Design a protein around this nucleic acid. Structure first.
Lengths: 66, 155, 95
RNA sequence: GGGUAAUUGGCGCAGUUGGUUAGCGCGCGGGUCUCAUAAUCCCGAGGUCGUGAGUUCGAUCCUCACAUUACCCA
RNA sequence: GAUGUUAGGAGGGCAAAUCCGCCGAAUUUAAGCAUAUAAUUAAGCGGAAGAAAAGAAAAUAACUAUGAUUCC
RNA sequence: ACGGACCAAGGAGUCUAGCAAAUGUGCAAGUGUAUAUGAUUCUUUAAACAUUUUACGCAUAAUUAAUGUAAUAUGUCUAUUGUAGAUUUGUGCCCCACUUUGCAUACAAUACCGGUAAGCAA
RNA sequence: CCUAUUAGCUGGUUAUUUUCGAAAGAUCUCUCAGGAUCGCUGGAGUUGAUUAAUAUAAUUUUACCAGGUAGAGAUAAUGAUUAGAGGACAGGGCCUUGACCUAUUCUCAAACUCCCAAUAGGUAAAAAGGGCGAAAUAACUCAAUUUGUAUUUCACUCAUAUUAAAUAAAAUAACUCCAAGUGGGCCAUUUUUGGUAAGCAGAACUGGCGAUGAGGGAUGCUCCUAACGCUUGGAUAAGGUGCCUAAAUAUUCGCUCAUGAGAUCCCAUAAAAGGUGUUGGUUCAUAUGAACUAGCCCUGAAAAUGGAUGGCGCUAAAGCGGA
RNA sequence: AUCCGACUGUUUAAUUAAAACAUAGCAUUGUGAAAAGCCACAACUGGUAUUAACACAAUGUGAUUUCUGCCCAGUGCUUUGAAUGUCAACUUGAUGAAAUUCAAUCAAGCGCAGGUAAACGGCGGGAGUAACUAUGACUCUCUUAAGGUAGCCAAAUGCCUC
RNA sequence: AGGGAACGGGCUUGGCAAAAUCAGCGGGGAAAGAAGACCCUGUUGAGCUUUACUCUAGUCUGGCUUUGUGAAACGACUUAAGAGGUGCUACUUUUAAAGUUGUUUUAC
RNA sequence: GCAGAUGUCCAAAGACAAGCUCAAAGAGAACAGAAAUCUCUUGUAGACUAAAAGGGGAAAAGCUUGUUUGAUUUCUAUUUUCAGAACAAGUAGAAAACGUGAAAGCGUGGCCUAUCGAUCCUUUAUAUUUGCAAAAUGACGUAAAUUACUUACUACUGUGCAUAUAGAGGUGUCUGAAAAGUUACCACAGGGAUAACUGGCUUGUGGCUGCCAAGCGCUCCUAGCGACGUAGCUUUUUGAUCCUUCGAUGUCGGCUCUUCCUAUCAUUGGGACGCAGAAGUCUCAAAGUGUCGGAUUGUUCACCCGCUAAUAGGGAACGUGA
RNA sequence: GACUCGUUCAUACUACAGUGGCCACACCAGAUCCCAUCAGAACUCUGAAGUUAAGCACUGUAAGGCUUGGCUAGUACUGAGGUGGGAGACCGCUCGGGAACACCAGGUGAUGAGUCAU
RNA sequence: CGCGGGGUGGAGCAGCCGGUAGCUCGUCGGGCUCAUAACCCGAAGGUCGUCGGUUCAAAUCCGGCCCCCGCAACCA
RNA sequence: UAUGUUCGUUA
RNA sequence: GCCCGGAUAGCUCAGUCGGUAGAGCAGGGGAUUGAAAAUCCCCGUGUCCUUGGUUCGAUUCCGAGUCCGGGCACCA
């Protein structure tokens, strides 16, 4: 038979029982669908940086370890 | 029964009195950078890139910038938790936010203030002063303007 | 709904350009008795037990989506382009 | 969806390369009046488009258009 | 072919847990129900043994090949 | 509103299969010795004990309908890169700011494997 | 006999203490007496915190946003809507009728708006960061092999000894796993739709009842106080102090006489209209006459067992309004 | 005196005895026979049938009296057809390397053309109109397969209606 | 009387209230009987009906088999020739009765 | 709940660009008038924009013209509903190829908000991707050697079928069964989650009582009435609701019997009158006493006949079926 | 005194007037050429005879509008409390927030980059 | 009331499937007849129930009214 | 051998 | 007993979303006729039932009464 169609009673206090949880807000976010031709060039930037650093590290290690 | 995209937006998505017409050409020159805050105010003259009804008047952070559009992270309350929503709009519907403008001006002002104070090696309190109870005042008023007040009768 | 018989549009195969295409209408084509589903159905229908599968008998809608068959005149290959549903569809009618 | 038939004068109707032809209908004049009875011309995109073809509505072709059977696994 | 109370013999019925043929449902499940499932089951009919039935390839494989049946 | 006149005794989430999580235990890139065999054990014992240096399950590698294909890559026995971060090392055996190392994990970035697209294609 | 068939339905479902503790929303569903799924709950575990501080907050402050509800208006528009006033096309007999125009005028709107609150809402308030420089990297970007951008490395340094506003039994946190019950709700205040109305039907906020006793409201699932281990003292809340009934026949000042007085929110009905009852006020009239006003009282005021301010009763109140 | 049923008869054992059922009478339908009608049966075989149209089987109505009207459009049932459309298996033909794929035809049925209402059943509406008023013999018109005929009626059948 | 699940024997406030018995009686115990038969719900049935869905006995009809021995007529196939239009060749008509096949009738 | 709309429509009503400005009014011009066309002025949109309604729009989003097919292929991040699953509809982009414009740019359908669909099956398109379980089928193809079972190298290999991917055929009960009735012969599990009867709240409706005074009453508002309006009471009607009862509260009427209410019909005693008398009407205190016999109807009600002093109205689970 | 590109988008608009032009803006002369139409009106191109008549600039009006302030008004409305008042409709008090229309007054712009002329 | 169907000449009815409204009877005039009918010849008459809406255009399509008709108003 | 009705009352 | 409807001449009946009051029959005069029927011309006749209100004015719009007639009805 006829029933209660709808109510929002008790819903707010159910919501506040375990608090209104906030998003975690991580430091880094995925760049998957974001600005291609910019993040690809950033990949190239980082590769250049890593190679320039790593060749110095290899040189120093080799010359200090004979 | 009816829950379309722009349902309920009869007044919110209407241009103000004598404020109709497209946006000024100066709006397109507004500088936007990643991570800065932004308000989502829908401009009904521009139909493409229009945000959803809910986000009109919400502030968010830029997470993406395209040739004519911006992606902004907006907190939306969904029952028992908040969640970030990535709303993608055109630049006409978005505006640089002043939500932290006092914070930025405070940062510069305090930078110079504590720079000079540390130069003069003084320990200064830099936080905002949350003004409360005022001190005593020894204030004199000419008795020619002290007005006596009585409650008024009925007419 | 009026659609012309030819169209300069992108070829998706064997030429990656915009070429002239012949536009026609796609038609269903008869269900062949050797199709695996038809063979399974016929073998199931053999014997006693009557009708063995549902027979749809509601038929709510009155139009069908129009499917255009596009044929690149250089890339001899074809392509399918579905349009919104309509009651009256003509190919190359009077302008 | 399959097979067949049909729709050419306002009415009815068969007829296919050297081909559109007709009975009723319109009109008028004919026979003491009215009945019934001869007549001249008017009336056709041979349903609709296209195709094969010195020589076609004509031969094929798709379209919707109506009537019979018979068919149904999203 | 028939016939014999000719001579000598056999079958019949009971019992069934296991076993061998046949015949053969519906409840049930599908949250309905019809194919399907229940189930090549129950019920019904017949037939054997201490086991029965299967069994010495018109079999597998595709390997460097195996080798009747049964059971784990 | 229904059940219960009274008393005694009986009376209802269990058993098996299968999956997972949790926790305890053993062993660990392995693990479980299945059926079965042996063996001075043959009341108990229908349990215990044992297994002449590729049985099988699960795991150790994924992915694709599939022919199949299959994880940095020999400059280095080295062990991808960041941001936080446990622990460790120093200087200011017990507080503290910089140093050193950087577990687990979280967030990202990179390579590489299978499939699909795209480009080329003897 | 298959068969202990099936049942989303009814009934039942067995020791103690202790600790935590709901839902009656939502989405889909041949769904509406059911189910799955989310939410709410328990248990387990890790990471944290254990450093009166950070994370954090049903709170504010500071700064900045967004709104068109209440109100307001009808001359801002639209849609209604009542009256006249002045004036150069139509009609008839220079005149009149109207139309139309101008400035006015009475009154309106859930599906009207020039304007526009209160409340509710959002974002920000520094260290994995900010500011300022150099040097690298890039296939991006630019006219730019050194424009810009981003990243990386070095510098320098931006309150902290009170903590980049306040306050905080804020880490009683965060996260993961497994899983129960629930998924008929109802009530009160305020708002609100349908309805003549309803202890009616439907919604919004919060608090409750449910799931919960205790003190009070005589009585009462929801009202007030207040939520609960077992005690001894103390002092209170709500509410009361004539007796029932613990405490005032207290004190102090007015009002009221009822031949159906009145007497604690919810709450247990009373109106229009009246009174030469009495008590105060107000404004006009030469201590008179009126007209108003509002306290208590009276009329209006009729129902069925005999009857209920809870009862007795109470009038120098034990009634009404104060202190 | 009215209603119902003609009558004798029968019935819901244990709430209805009747107006219900039966009935004689009436009418219709099938069937000429072991290759028939109706019916039973898994098969084999059987019932009617020790039967034969004055018979058997299947229905409806319900003594007598007097009657039994119109409609074959619908739905049933039924009759004829090589002019006849459609259709299955099969068969035949073409193609193919074959599976197949394509065509074509003398079944019944339906369709076409008839018959049949004591088969199921059905059986109209507006206006105008007569030398007080009223009514409408008469007229006009729409319409059906036919338009409820002879009769009978506020009936065990009429709401309004006491 | 009140309130209460809106008709109490119990609760609250009142009226009241004095053992044990006998015989009647039908106000009440919303008295007893008995898991409401009306109504609704159930993805629970059953009887019945039909132009509900899907089937089925029977029945009608065709095909193959059973199924033998003869005759005739017709049809069709193959073959040769002529005729019609017709680009060594391609298609239709007629002429034989020549070898082969299907049908209808008929005899035993 | 209220006012509506959707199952479409569009080769342009989609894309781009340019030029232009619309509705309406007024004045003026042969036929020509309230409307025909032409000219000027005013004109914030009072037009148009496919459709409902709401938003948007003036060198445009409207009108005209020109050129077109971006209504194209592929893929992300996502928004709405929300479980933050799916479909669907959008938003911002990326890789191709294009259109338009002089260009900046704009275009992944319609200015925005609606216009739609899973699995399985089928269908047709794509493929230098695959399979059909011992193999072969383009093809002994291309090069060498001989009486052969010679050798090396080739992206391109039979019919049919199956797969992968992509549209389409549809479920409108639109997260998507293939489905007619009847039971007055009925069955079961339940339901007071839910009707039919009492009771309860309400009182539109029924009944009863007020207030005002326009009129009626010869004149005269109020003797007696009282329209237009308006305030209440009762629960004697009927509705509305669905709170209590479906492991049952016996469901109409009459008969019988008692008690109660008063809104008094008669009887008692009064007041008023449009009160001479008689009769009567209005009204007060009053519930002590009484309120009948019959015809028809199951009836309540009714309606007649008649007596009466009067033949009042109601309640008690529609009082009352152990 | 000017112009070009802008910003604000009425204090900037509208009506009616008045005043003004070294170059400058313009109106203006013309249609061979590019271009354009029914129409050299517009648009396009080529000019420099004329003119401030207009556009343009500045000013005026007990001007309309717009804008700012006041006043409406602590009015309307409203958040929290109340065993507050009242039969109800409604209306106070405590802790707080606080309009609008109308009316009155002032005002009618300001400004970035670049350039020309003197 | 819940619908679903229709309103057109004086009457009964087509068009009412948007663009030019028809059929009959009726009425009017003239013939034929002594006259009347019948017959012949020729005319007229529909504001399409009303009020709005879309369209260039509505009697037609779309709503609302006003009538009329036909069904349903069942279980207790 | 098609159709072709009627003529108010009295004198 | 409420829910509807009409009251219009001497009788019987129509009235622009208020303004004028009308046809037929009865009715006198006629016109026709030898006369009379029929036909045709003109007379006349009404608070538009009775009261009240609305109005500038009412048959019309209200409200009530009166007469007469069309649809009402409650349970089990």
């Amino acid at each position: 038979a006829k029933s209660k169609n709808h109510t929002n009673h008790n819903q707010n206090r159910k919501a506040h029982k375990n608090g209104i949880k906030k998003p975690k807000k991580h430091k880094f976010m995925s760049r998957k669908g974001l600005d291609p031709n910019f993040f690809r060039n950033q990949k190239y930037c980082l590769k250049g940086i890593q190679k320039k650093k790593k060749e110095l590290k290899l040189k120093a290690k080799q010359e200090k370890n004979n | 029964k009816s829950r379309g995209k722009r349902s309920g937006t009869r007044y919110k998505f209407s241009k103000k009195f004598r404020k109709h017409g497209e946006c000024t050409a100066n709006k397109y020159l507004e500088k936007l950078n990643y991570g800065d805050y932004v308000d989502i105010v829908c401009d009904s003259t521009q139909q493409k890139g229009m945000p959803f009804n809910y986000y009109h008047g919400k502030t968010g952070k830029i997470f993406h910038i395209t040739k004519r559009g911006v992606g902004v992270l907006v907190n939306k309350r969904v029952k028992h938790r908040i969640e970030q929503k990535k709303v993608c709009v055109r630049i006409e519907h978005v505006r640089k936010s002043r939500c932290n403008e006092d914070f930025l001006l405070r940062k510069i002002k305090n930078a110079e203030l504590i720079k000079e104070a540390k130069l003069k090696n003084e320990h200064i309190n830099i936080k905002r002063k949350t003004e409360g109870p005022k001190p005593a005042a020894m204030i004199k008023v000419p008795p020619s303007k002290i007005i006596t007040i009585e409650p008024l009768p009925f007419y | 709904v009026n659609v012309p018989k030819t169209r300069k549009t992108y070829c998706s195969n064997k030429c990656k350009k915009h070429t002239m295409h012949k536009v026609s209408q796609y038609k269903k084509g008869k269900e062949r008795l050797s199709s695996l589903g038809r063979r399974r159905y016929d073998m199931k229908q053999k014997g006693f037990g009557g009708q063995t599968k549902p027979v749809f008998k509601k038929k709510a809608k009155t139009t069908k989506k129009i499917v255009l068959k596009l044929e690149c005149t250089k890339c001899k290959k074809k392509r399918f382009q579905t349009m919104k549903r309509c009651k009256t569809f003509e190919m190359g009618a009077d302008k």
